[PDB]
Design an enzyme around this catalytic site. Structure first.
Site, short mmCIF file in Angstrom:
data_model
loop_
_atom_site.label_atom_id
_atom_site.label_comp_id
_atom_site.label_asym_id
_atom_site.label_seq_id
_atom_site.Cartn_x
_atom_site.Cartn_y
_atom_site.Cartn_z
N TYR A 130 39.44 3.01 -32.59
CA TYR A 130 40.14 2.53 -33.46
C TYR A 130 39.21 1.36 -33.97
O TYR A 130 39.24 0.27 -33.33
CB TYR A 130 41.43 1.73 -32.83
CG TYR A 130 42.46 1.01 -33.76
CD1 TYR A 130 43.21 1.75 -34.85
CD2 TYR A 130 42.39 -0.31 -33.59
CE1 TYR A 130 44.00 0.78 -35.65
CE2 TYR A 130 43.09 -0.94 -34.82
CZ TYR A 130 44.12 -0.56 -35.62
OH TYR A 130 45.08 -0.98 -36.53
N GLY A 131 38.86 1.47 -35.15
CA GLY A 131 37.76 0.23 -35.73
C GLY A 131 36.60 0.33 -35.57
O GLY A 131 35.70 0.55 -36.48
N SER A 132 36.14 0.40 -34.38
CA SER A 132 34.77 0.33 -33.77
C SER A 132 33.74 1.39 -34.49
O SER A 132 33.06 1.01 -35.30
CB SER A 132 34.41 0.35 -32.27
OG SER A 132 35.24 -0.64 -31.72
N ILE A 133 34.00 2.76 -34.37
CA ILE A 133 33.11 3.67 -34.62
C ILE A 133 33.89 4.46 -35.73
O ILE A 133 34.32 5.63 -35.29
CB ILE A 133 32.43 4.63 -33.57
CG1 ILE A 133 31.89 4.00 -32.27
CG2 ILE A 133 31.41 5.63 -33.98
CD1 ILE A 133 32.78 3.65 -31.29
N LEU A 134 34.21 3.90 -36.75
CA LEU A 134 34.71 4.64 -37.74
C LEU A 134 33.82 4.61 -39.02
O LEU A 134 34.08 4.83 -40.07
CB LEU A 134 36.00 3.90 -38.23
CG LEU A 134 37.12 3.95 -37.26
CD1 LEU A 134 38.47 3.38 -37.73
CD2 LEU A 134 37.44 5.29 -36.63
N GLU A 135 32.60 4.30 -38.62
CA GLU A 135 31.61 4.36 -39.61
C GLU A 135 30.30 4.95 -39.15
O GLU A 135 29.91 4.55 -37.86
CB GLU A 135 31.44 2.68 -40.11
CG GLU A 135 30.84 1.66 -39.17
CD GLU A 135 31.00 0.41 -39.56
OE1 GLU A 135 29.82 0.29 -40.36
OE2 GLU A 135 31.79 -0.59 -39.39
N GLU A 138 30.95 -2.68 -25.38
CA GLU A 138 32.30 -2.81 -25.83
C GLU A 138 33.67 -2.54 -25.19
O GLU A 138 34.58 -3.23 -25.32
CB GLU A 138 32.08 -2.64 -27.39
CG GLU A 138 31.23 -3.26 -28.25
CD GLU A 138 31.11 -2.77 -29.84
OE1 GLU A 138 31.99 -3.44 -30.60
OE2 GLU A 138 30.54 -1.93 -30.05
#
Length: 165
Positions: free
Chosen positions: A14-19, A82
């Site tokens: 959720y958030g971190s590795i969504l890119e 993280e």
């Protein structure tokens, strides 16, 4: 040697590795995320804590993406980096991409004992804020990639020749 083994991992993030940039810096290479929704957990905003969390076996669901094709070596980096106050738990999510249900790992908050910020914040605010951030980033990167000043890679960097006088 450096070689990935069988038993590929799927981890709901959720958030971190969504890119791509983040996936590439976390592992080495860009991992593929697939859109999936975690029914059974509830996402909170947590203003003050480092972008957490999902806790409580709630009747709601969290829509995010699962990082697929993660080797056991690769997976470990998410736990190390993280995932400081996070713990790995196995949750089952629906791969929105195909509407199928898949069992994955995810990171929940170890301070989960007490439901903190149990009220779920404005989705619309999240929508606009993440959007603005990506939108600015693409527009501004495009400006640079367009070269407005005719600024070149070697030109932009203040390189030294070491002049001897």
């Amino acid at each position: 040697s450096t070689s990935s083994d069988p038993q590929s991992h799927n981890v709901f993030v959720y958030g971190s590795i969504l890119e791509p940039a983040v996936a590439a810096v976390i592992l080495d290479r860009t991992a593929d995320t697939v859109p999936a929704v975690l029914h059974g957990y509830h996402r909170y905003k947590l203003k003050g804590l480092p972008y957490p969390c999902i806790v409580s076996s709630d009747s709601g669901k969290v829509n995010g993406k699962v990082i697929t094709g993660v080797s056991d070596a690769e997976l470990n980096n998410f736990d190390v980096i993280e995932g400081n106050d996070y713990e790995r738990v196995t949750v089952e999510v629906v791969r929105m991409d195909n509407s199928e249900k898949v069992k994955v790992e995810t990171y929940v908050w170890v301070n989960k004992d007490d439901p903190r910020m149990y009220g779920e914040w404005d989705f619309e605010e999240w929508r606009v804020v993440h959007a603005e951030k990506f939108v600015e980033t693409f527009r501004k990167m495009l400006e640079w990639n367009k070269n407005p000043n005719g600024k070149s890679m070697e030109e932009a960097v203040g390189s030294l020749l070491s002049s001897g006088d």
